[PDB]
Amino acid sequence: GLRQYYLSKIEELQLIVNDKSQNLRRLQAQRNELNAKVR
Amino acid sequence: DLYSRYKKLQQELEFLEVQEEYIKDEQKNLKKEFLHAQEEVKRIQSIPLVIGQFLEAVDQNTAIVGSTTGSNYYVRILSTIDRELLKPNASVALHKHSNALV
Amino acid sequence: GIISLLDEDEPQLKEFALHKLNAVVNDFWAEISESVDKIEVLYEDEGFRSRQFAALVASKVFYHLGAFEESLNYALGAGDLFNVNDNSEYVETIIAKCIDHYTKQCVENADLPEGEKKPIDQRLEGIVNKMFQRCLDDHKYKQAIGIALETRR
Amino acid sequence: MSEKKQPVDEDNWDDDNVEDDFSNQLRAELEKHGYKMETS
Amino acid sequence: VSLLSESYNPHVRYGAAMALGICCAGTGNKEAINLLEPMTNDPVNYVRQGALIASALIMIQQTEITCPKVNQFRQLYSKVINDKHDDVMAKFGAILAQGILDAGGHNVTISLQSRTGHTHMPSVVGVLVFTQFWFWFPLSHFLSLAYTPTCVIGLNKDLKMPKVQYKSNCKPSTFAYPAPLEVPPEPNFQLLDNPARVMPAQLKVLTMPETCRYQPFKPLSIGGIIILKDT
Amino acid sequence: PPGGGEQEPPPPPAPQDVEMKEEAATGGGSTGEADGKTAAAAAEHSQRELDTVTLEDIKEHVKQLEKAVSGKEPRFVLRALRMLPSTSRRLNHYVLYKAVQGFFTSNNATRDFLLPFLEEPMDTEADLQFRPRTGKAASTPLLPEVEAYLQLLVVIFMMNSKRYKEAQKISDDLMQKISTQNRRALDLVAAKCYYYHARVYEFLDKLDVVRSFLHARLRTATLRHDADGQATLLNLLLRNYLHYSLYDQAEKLVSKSVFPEQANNNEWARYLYYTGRIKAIQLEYSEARRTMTNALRKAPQHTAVGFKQTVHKLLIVVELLLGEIPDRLQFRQPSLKRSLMPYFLLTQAVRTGNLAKFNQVLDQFGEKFQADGTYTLIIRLRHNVIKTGVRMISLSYSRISLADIAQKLQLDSPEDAEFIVAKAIRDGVIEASINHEKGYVQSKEMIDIYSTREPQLAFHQRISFCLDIHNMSVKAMRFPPKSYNKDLESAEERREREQQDLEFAKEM
């Protein structure tokens, strides 16, 4: 099924997008402060 | 089209996995990099050192001193100096040319 | 309460027990969810006429408790009683694992098809081209252009 | 904010510990000792 | 790579600019020009240089309507080449960026890529060999393999030029020219001969010849040469 | 009529004044910024929706003369609310019914007139696809009926209005809830309507149908989306099963949705209490007094009479089961004067070593402890009373006869006071021997428990945890780090002046 096998795979991935994305968002500015201290 | 909606979306997880580990390298990488720079700056406090006397600061970490040559100056300072070691009337150290706190 | 008579040793009260496992599978579904799982007992038993429906309701209850491939093996071995209905919010639960293990196995079958291939339980590929003909006949060809890639065939 | 669904509807604390220990015990000593003088 | 534009070394800060310059050079990438805008400001001469190289590669054959930073930068290369106090490495990207930026009379362009999907490998070798001007100056003179035209060509026999004159439909200011100044009511129906230049973004805005004697047997989508059937 | 005519006509426009800017702004933002734009980044209409609960909790009481809420329903139910060219007249229609309340008379909605205020999913192009509009425009009349409740000819109006909102809820359960907060935005509306639903349609009506409807609501939960349906559908599942004795405590053990992942500190806070009383009735072994304590410390500043009385009582009820007891009545705000006196009077007996003093409580307030229904947990405390006594005496005296402790503990039998003492040895508690032939129970002096490695464990429990709360004071800290635009080294033009004057001194 496309509606009921395949659309069941959009519902799962987006959760990993939104939080691993957010962890990256925290970590990059956490590096960026240190880059400011470096230069 | 529904078909690209899952393949192109796992495409960017497949892309996304190489960013948090990659800057997780940089949590330590600019530590071990930064400490090269950290002790590096103190070369100016070599040995040809002339003496001033601290007077006051405009702000944080930029100040005004009274030289033993008699004249006074608006100078900069080394960051590692504990600033709370300053001001009885502080005997300070000046660079002989660039004329800043040592 | 009906769980208490799963030791009758008369192959009519297993049938009567599974009479009450589809209409009332929302209240003491909570009850027989972790305690009793004797589906495979009569399912592997020589006692027939009552194992066909037994793997359906285990595929119901083990689905919601994370025993997904447990619901997928019983989903395959449940038979004609299992795939007879596609008019629920439950066919969505079972083909989500069937076509899953299908195509994630078919990546390895894109690796090495020749030798150590799939022992298909004859519906694991059967509902593939079945519902794929539903794609061919329900006018959707932006997906009939796509699941024909999903099979990697 | 604070919707808080309703299924139903010092000066104090040193006084509360001495309330805990000093709870139900004879309450009125001026006479207890003066009556233990001759009995005890 | 914009994150890598702020490396604490000017080497990775330098190579970030050439990374954009090899990525988006076919496009008038407004984002990439936006990133390359402060890249000329750096106190390092060679990253100021490579800022001008990537700033030259981003906008060839682009006249003011793909992005307005074209003439913002034409004054800038003269602005840095006409100073005496600059570095020779600094204005070197400007005297370089002129011959880049006005290459072939706006008739040749870069293309690491066919319309088919296949990359153009002598342009690929031309740009990779173009990167190593560091250790040999005419080593990056190997660049002529990257220069590719943007022109349709009509044809009917093995040799004979046809006489086709089609036109365009969209906003005609896209057909702007360099137009040098030399100090001592609007037509969208641009008639073209057989060797006529056209932007690849202007391959969609043209009109097919429907009234001429000639009619293209091929659907006109790419430039280059095609058979143009005499009807 | 001057008295009504001078205090009654200002009520109508000033609630209209706040309702054209709170939920007409929720009308302009929760329908155009959630059904059309992202609300996960901008979920302010959730807490704004909380505010449109809170103001309306204590906003309406009266039977609404002058049509100050009763004329809102003929006003606010005639809504297309399709798009801005169809709502630019609706913004006038927020004003046009003020002339219907004021110039004319409106329809006085008084226990009878809700039926022509309900059948508008059709009137002037109303829809069901904007269920951020139709669920808010469901709730927005589904609240003020059922807020005061009006159980007199209001249960069927409430009921049918719940039927219409349930048609919206089935369109939510079936029809395009993906990434719209159709599911998520109406899990708050669904969740909050479960309580009015549960305060007309639970105790007055049959809840056990809402059991299977709630199992289906949980079935469609956790598949399509795992937030906001993983949360409310479990305390809202729990609240009558606790009141019942159904098996679903062990089902709650084997449940996957035991974590709903940061359930908004209200359902999440009370949730730990709702699982605390689970192991209370299933025999607290000091496991859940931390989840009672945790449920307490996650609870807000509103009033204690809600549930904070009962976690304040039951939280220690399980530690009276252990034997430990603090002073409870230390914060006499609105909780430590009213509802304690039987229950502190209980632990007043527990802090004694007296036996039938417990009975002198247990007859005095046996019914008060049955008013809450804790009495089956109350009934088992004689064990901890007598272990309190034997630790007390066994700590106090050393070589004491067993023919004294039955009399002092008013046990009325020394012959089994060999056996209560004997099992006090058996179960752990006290160690040393009874000269059962003689009758004295000797006890040894066990000092220097320090070099006994118990307080190292009393550390290491707290070493690890205190390191953890430093770690959380780190992990909660680093969200601030932002607006760090440019680490400018020195300059450019002043660097050109530095090389310029440097070139002057270099030629010099």
* A26 touching F (Cβ < 8 Å): yes
Query: Closest Cα partner for B18 from E3, A24, E17?
Result: A24
Experimental method reported for this structure: cryo-EM
Are the CB atoms for E163 and E169 separated by under 8 Å? no
CA F117 to chain centre: 33
Report the chain D residue with the minimal C-alpha distance to residue F372: D8
Residues of C in contact with A3 (CB under 8 A): 92
Which token pair is B11?
């495409």
* E8 touching A (Cβ < 8 Å): yes
Smallest Cα distance from F474 to chain E, Å: 25
* A25 touching B (Cβ < 8 Å): no
| H/E stretch holding B6 | helix B4-38
Are the CB atoms for C77 and C55 separated by under 8 Å? yes
* Contact state of F490 with E6 under an 8 Å Cβ cutoff: no
Distance CA E196, CA C139 (A): 45
Q: 3-class DSSP state for residue A33?
A: helix
Are the CB atoms for F292 and F315 separated by under 8 Å? yes
Which token pair is F350?
């527990």
Interface-testing mutation among C68, C99, C104, C124, with chain A (most A C-beta atoms within 10 A): C99
Are the CB atoms for F162 and F107 separated by under 8 Å? no
Query: Closest Cα partner for E59 from E41, E73, E48?
Result: E73
F291: CB partners within 8 A, 6+ apart:
F272, F273, F275, F276
Which token pair is F383?
């064990």
* Contact state of D17 with F327 under an 8 Å Cβ cutoff: yes
In degrees, rounded to 5, the angle at the alpha carbon of residue B15 between the alpha carbons of residues B12 and B20 is: 115
* Contact state of B16 with A38 under an 8 Å Cβ cutoff: no
Residues of A in contact with B27 (CB under 8 A): 27, 30-31
Residues of C in contact with F250 (CB under 8 A): 34
Paired sense of beta strands E108-110 and B62-67, if any? unpaired
Q: 3-class DSSP state for residue F478?
A: coil
Distance CA E65, CA E67 (A): 5
Query: Closest Cα partner for E51 from F411, E43, E132?
Result: E43
Query: Closest Cα partner for F117 from F152, F184, F170, F70?
Result: F70
D11: Cα within 13 Å, side-chain hemisphere: 3
Q: Return the CA Rg of chain F.
A: 33
Q: Which residues pair with E149 in a beta bridge?
A: E108
Report the chain D residue with the minimal C-alpha distance to residue F333: D12
Residues of F in contact with A32 (CB under 8 A): 481, 484
Q: 3-class DSSP state for residue E208?
A: coil
Q: How far is CA C149 from CA A1, C109, C113, C131, C143, in A?
A: 14, 14, 17, 14, 10
Q: Which residues pair with B53 in a beta bridge?
A: B66, B91
Are the CB atoms for F275 and F291 separated by under 8 Å? yes
Distance CA E119, CA E112 (A): 5
Order of strands, sheet of B72-76, starting from the edge strand that comes earlier in the sequence:
B72-76, B62-67, B49-59, B91-95
How many distinct helices (H) and strands (E) make up chain E?
6, 7
Nearest to E41 among F487, F490, F492 (CB): F492
F184: CB partners within 8 A, 6+ apart:
F39, F40, F225, F227, F228
* F329 touching D (Cβ < 8 Å): yes
F462: Cα within 13 Å, side-chain hemisphere: 6
* Contact state of A35 with E3 under an 8 Å Cβ cutoff: no
Are the CB atoms for F136 and F31 separated by under 8 Å? yes
Q: 3-class DSSP state for residue F396?
A: helix
Interface of F with C (CB under 8 A): 211-212, 215-216, 219-220, 223, 246-248, 250-251, 254, 256
Smallest Cα distance from F489 to chain A, Å: 7
Query: Closest Cα partner for F311 from F283, F347, F275?
Result: F275
* C3 touching F (Cβ < 8 Å): no
Distance CA E51, CA E35 (A): 10
CA E10 to chain centre: 27
Which token pair is C77?
């071995």
Residues of E in contact with A39 (CB under 8 A): 8
* Contact state of C30 with F220 under an 8 Å Cβ cutoff: no
* Contact state of F500 with E43 under an 8 Å Cβ cutoff: no
Residues of F in contact with A8 (CB under 8 A): 223
Distance CA E94, CA E40 (A): 11
Are the CB atoms for F233 and F193 separated by under 8 Å? no
Q: Which burial class, exposed, middle or buried, applies to D35 when counting CB atoms under 10 A from its CB (0-12, 13-18, 19+)? A: exposed
What is the signed CA dihedral for F481, F485, F489, F490, rounded to 10 degrees?
-120
Residue where the block lists tokens 């709870």: D23
Q: Which burial class, exposed, middle or buried, applies to F404 when counting CB atoms under 10 A from its CB (0-12, 13-18, 19+)? A: middle
* Contact state of D9 with F57 under an 8 Å Cβ cutoff: no
CA B1 to chain centre: 53
Residues of F in contact with C1 (CB under 8 A): none
Which token pair is F232?
């409310």
* Contact state of F484 with A15 under an 8 Å Cβ cutoff: no
Report the chain C residue with the minimal C-alpha distance to residue F211: C27
Residue where the block lists tokens 């679903």: F248
Nearest to F254 among C28, C34, C93 (CB): C34
